[PDB]
């Protein structure tokens, strides 16, 4: 079968950052192509062909005039016509970082997690093996419990246990994957900084519906220049665009806040991770020699393991048999169950 | 199952070189067919049928006139009508080289990599076999370490190790696949040279929206010639085409730069490859007898293997157990683990 | 699984001969149906229904008139209307020969190659068997090498090797499949000879965009004949058709040249084939008794096997272990490897 | 898996007889619906609604008038409107016989060929068994060869060989399947006789493109009858229909000729079939007791087996090992190979 | 896999009774929607909106008028508008009985045929077993043959032979399934009786294309009633509907004739059925105790068995090894083959 590399945070982010804006984009496209581009109040003299020319020129030129001349460069309205493509551009731009992280991390994370799942499976098999002599030691004794636990900790270190210790020690000082994850999310934030600014500058000031274009050719001059006509036009699609702009602004701002909160929780406020607590459940040191640097590789690997917690069978059951992450502090029940489950079968 | 032959770099290149321009092409087609081809300001007399004839003729002829006669050959505008097809032609042309390389390298690379993966699997199985006597030699000894490593290197040459040496020696002087890869990427660059030039010539000079056509027939002469009418027309689709042209120019220029940078890094600045370092991890000579020519077949086979790194199981684990590519310079732990993992099982 | 019979060159030919023209045909259809069939400058008096009748009649009749009567038969323009169907006809005609060859060779080539792949597999298994006693012979000896090779050639002839020799001898004088392949490619060339001629005769002379039709009925005579009106019409789709005609002409001419070059290389300039050299690698006579007639069945079976080179596992490896097609001229390493690989396993 | 019953000649016939006419029919439909039904030169007085009524009535009535009254029954043109449905009817009618033969022969031919393939497999297994003692007999002898072959023919008759003889004798006088095949192909020819005649009558009689209809009601009489107006109409789709009619005529005539030639070759000129020659290859009588009647069931079963030649494995190889259909006339090599292949394995 | 129950004759019937009329109905829909509903010769005064109102009213009312008043109920034409739905209704009604039979017989036929196929398989295995001692008896003897056959017939009764006898005896008097099949076919005929009559009534008398409707409202009265205008209208779709009606009539009448002939052949003229002759082949009584009532269950089960002939392997071969349905009357070959094929294998 296949192993998962997603994580609910990342998929929620990509959904709310790309899928929703794509839906709004297609909705705007449908609304705009269902209606007519522009509505121009052509004079009475205009024939139907001339009126069509006016309604086409005023939608291609799309530049508002002023009562008097008042300028040679008068305000334009091109953004009302260009937005429903800029939204697609923003959707693609904000979808790029997920693809980049996928390309840059697929093989590496696949290999690392493939090794880690087997390593944890063997670690919990070793835990099953090592809990067996504890009951015999306790009966031999029959603080007692404290000294028994201390001597067990001293004398239990297995070869694969040293393998785990060395692996954790080397990973703790190899922040490559944490670097990549932080880079991906910071890149998402920085890219989102662009459309937020653009839309806020578009929702804020450039919200105009009606203008008055000026047609230039004006035939019928009869060897003369001819009268330059001014035609008042109104755009029908500005309202939905101006509403979708605000919707997208709010959505992307909320996504930015969510990303920042998650990063702060993971790299500053977080103290205990998944794998560390899971190992401590069976009983290990978890000393600071591989800690005190929250910007650590295992720190994020914990999240992937938690998502893939059920990709490995054994661990699963061992987690739900007990609680409190003190599996080795009971005298009889929790360890006696494993004793009768495994020791006799051999 | 299937084995991959696509490098992330090549897939990124083909995406950004073909898929994006195809998307822009279909967007331009949608915009052009949603709108109306041309908008002509027909005179007042023109009936609807005559106006339709004018709006069709001026879009078929598509040749701008001048105030006076001033010529018999006056500037044309055929490109504004022809571009959204030349863009498809460029997309297909730039997709050609990938298909050519596929057709010319499928079987050869398939066979070569099928042989290489099995060879490396057997090589690492041999490494597992050969690490076992090293611990026994060390205990027999109990600079010591340096002389032990030297004698091990001298006396460890295995039959399949000689197979590997001969294979590498013969591949180092057979640059066929490197020739083909350089040819493919240089061909992509050369093909990109064409549309870049064309679009830059189109975005640069031939960018105008409004012209004035001259209708020729002019019936209603009543046994006479008739009046040759001049009709001012405006194209609605020039703006989007002129923007997509710039977008494509920038995209393809960036792709060209990426191609050149990758080639320079791979064939000039690169010093160490994947397979060489991987073999040196277990310990081999890696002498210059099969090196000093970066334009080498194994140089790219390294990249193909790296993409297919996880297609071979054993190697994977052996990479993450240790680091520093000095697996055999550790006295106990690294080789003691393998000794207990393999020697006792026999 | 399935076995291939595509031989890249044929697939390239059929692509460039059928698939591309089909794409151009559908592009022309899209352009023609997106536009209007004809644009006619109807007089002022014409109502909308009469103008529609004129624009329909002048596109159904589609025969250009002349200033005066000047004839009862005046030049026509039916090809501008008929081409985008003749192009489909040419595509189908050029696709026919591939289907014919498939129908006529499927079963026979399937059977022949199914026999040949197993036959070569057994041959290389025999080669593995026969290299084993050679090393013992050399050690017994310990020109020596030349006499050893000669005696080995004399005394090594195996039963299945006589099967090989008889099969090759009988195939060398049975040119049925070579006949069929030459017939297929010559038929493709001959069928291409038609569309090239037609399109060149169309791109060359029958190229004009505007004509003047003459409407016949002319009601409103009020018990009289009525005025025969002349209406100037312009076709919008001639330009794209005239460009696609040239594109197809160039493409099919290049395909013809490629076919001719490939045939000349294969049947005249070619001297060594795949199977012959592959057998000589292990060492056989390859005498002219089954050669000197390049128009030979085994000649194209060699290409078919080369395409299917990896459909037989063993051979593959045996090709990449050595080079120079002198596998049995090395004293030790090449045959010592096989000796340790096979002799001990028995 | 599945067994084939397609006999490529039949598939070619059905292709060129049904699929091509269906393609032409859909092409005609596309052309007719893309265009306008009829083009009528309505007078000036007509409004747009009256002009639409005229253009609809003259295409529903579709009956040409004459200058004077000249009749009450004047020539009609209904076939120009009805053909693109008669073509569909002809396509379905000519597809019927294939479906009829399928329904009437599926089970019977399935069972017969399922029995025959196993019978021939067993027959060639017996051939392998029986060639073994021939070498021993020859060595015992060591005309000699002729007497050995004669005595082998006399004494070799095996049980399943008598089974084969009885089966062939009973099939030779049971012409049911040959009857059915001849009936199918003669029925295809007879059904083709209809559309050939109809189209040749249509491609030769109906060539009118233009007529002059007479509208009947003519309101505005103001308590009077009103003027019966005559409107000249032109059909746009007659040209393509008239061309497709000729194309279909030629195609179906060529198919008829191909069918007749194939039947004449199979049932009159044919002398040797597949199964008879294949059995004679190993050596049997093939006497006229089951021959002299070319209209025989086994005659077409031979073609069916030839199409299914590779559906049985053993036979395949046994065909390519030798040639000349004289397998048992070779002294050593051909039979010695089989001896070493089979006799020792037991 | 799946077992077949379609009885291809019933597939032919359902095809020709439902699938063809559905094709004709969709063709009529395509014709009617490609054209316009009605063509009305509106007077000159009518504007375009009033003309549209007239062309819609006269097609909604669809009731022909008369020159004088002549009635308050004048002939209608609703059928010309209602037929292309009545055809769909008839198609569904005709498809109903097949669905009913399937729903009512699926499980029962599944169980019955599942039993019977294995039952016949066991019967033919028993026949293979029982032919073996016959050769021994014949050699013991060495009318002789007649006495041997009669003593075999008396002494060969096996337990499963009595199972066969009892099953046949009990089925012969259980005519439920024959009842169901006859009911299905007679119901198909009776349901066909409706559309045949309706269409023959529609094709016969209700055939007129042109009528003259009378518009009622007639505004512009200026405080007065207004002039009741009469508008001549013509339907364009009557011709194709009238042709399709005749086509359907002929098709369904021919289907009725086929059904009647098949039923008469099956239940009156039929004498020997598949299973009876198949069992008589190996030799059984087939006495009239389970016969003389052609309206019998096994009578129809024979057809399903014949369709499912090849669904049981053994039977197949045993049918074609011999002929004449006298397998046991041959002395040596037919029985010696089975003897040497089975007796030695035990
Ligand atoms: C209108 O038509 C007359 C002749 O028909 C021509 O002289 C005049 O220039 C036309 N006016 C315009 C504005 O084209
Ligand atoms: C105008 O109409 C009259 C008759 O109605 C015709 O003789 C004349 O040719 C028409 N003029 C043109 C320019 O077609
Ligand atoms: C013109 O209209 C009148 C009635 O308005 C009609 O009688 C006459 O036939 C029409 N012209 C022709 C050529 O039919
Ligand atoms: C045309 O209109 C006038 C009044 O508007 C009316 O009297 C006359 O009957 C109308 N024509 C017909 C054919 O009814
Ligand atoms: C025509 O217009 C007048 C006023 O302009 C109005 O009173 C009258 O009702 C109109 N005609 C009809 C038929 O309504």
From Swiss-Prot, chains A, B, C, D, E:
Assembly notes: Homoheptameric.
Glycosylation sites: 45
Gene: PANX2
Main subcellular localisation: membrane
Species the sequence originates in: Homo sapiens (Human)
Record flagged with keyword Aminoacyl-tRNA synthetase: no
PTM summary: S-palmitoylated in neural stem and progenitor cells. Cleaved by CASP3 and CASP7 during apoptosis. Cleavage has no effect on it function.
Parts of the chain on the Extracellular side: 30-82, 204-246
Catalysed reactions, semicolon-separated: ATP(in) = ATP(out); chloride(in) = chloride(out); iodide(out) = iodide(in); Na(+)(in) = Na(+)(out)
GO biological process terms, semicolon-separated: cell-cell signaling; monoatomic cation transport; monoatomic ion transmembrane transport; positive regulation of interleukin-1 production; response to ischemia
Protein's membrane topology: Multi-pass membrane protein
Listed result of changing residue 106 to F: In a breast cancer sample; somatic mutation
Keyword Transferase in annotation: no
Function per UniProt: Ion channel with a slight anion preference. Also able to release ATP. Plays a role in regulating neurogenesis and apoptosis in keratinocytes.
Keywords noted in UniProt: Cell membrane, Endoplasmic reticulum, Glycoprotein, Golgi apparatus, Ion channel, Ion transport, Membrane, Phosphoprotein, Transmembrane, Transmembrane helix, Transport
Protein name, per record: Pannexin-2
Gene Ontology cellular component list: endoplasmic reticulum membrane; Golgi membrane; plasma membrane
Compartment(s) of residence: Cell membrane; Golgi apparatus membrane; Endoplasmic reticulum membrane
Boundaries of the shown chain within the full protein: 42 to 392 of 677
Transmembrane segments: 7-29, 83-105, 181-203, 247-269
GO molecular function: gap junction channel activity; protein-containing complex binding; structural molecule activity; wide pore channel activity
